[PDB]
């Protein structure tokens, strides 16, 4: 019998971070994993890939993280999961405090 944290505290973490998310973590780089696990919309996936080579795409990101807030525990679980393969380093870097 275990008990869950709120999404916004989950998220709170990370976004505290949201300075280095949006200049190293791309939407573009994991848009298949984060759809694959439906934390990402089709709609969404699109709206990424629109602005995927520009620097509208780092603004994207800071926008990206609401997104995935409405999704909290899921985003939260498949963003870590997201990191872990593709910036395994930052991923360590902004759980290790």
């Not at 696990?37 to 969404?44: G, H, M, Q, Y």
């Not at 609401?66 to 899921?74: M, N």
Request: charged share 30%; glycine share 6%; net charge negative.
């Amino acid at each position: 019998m275990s008990d869950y944290e709120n999404d916004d505290e989950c998220w709170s973490v990370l976004e505290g971070f949201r300075v280095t998310l949006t200049s190293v973590i791309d939407p573009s780089r994991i848009t298949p994993y984060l759809r694959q696990c439906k934390v990402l919309n089709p709609d969404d996936e699109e709206q990424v890939l629109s602005d995927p080579n520009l620097v509208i795409r780092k603004r994207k990101v800071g926008v990206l993280l609401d997104i995935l807030q409405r999704t909290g525990h899921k985003g939260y679980v498949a963003f870590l999961e997201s990191l872990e393969l593709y910036y395994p380093q930052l991923y360590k870097k902004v759980t290790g405090k």
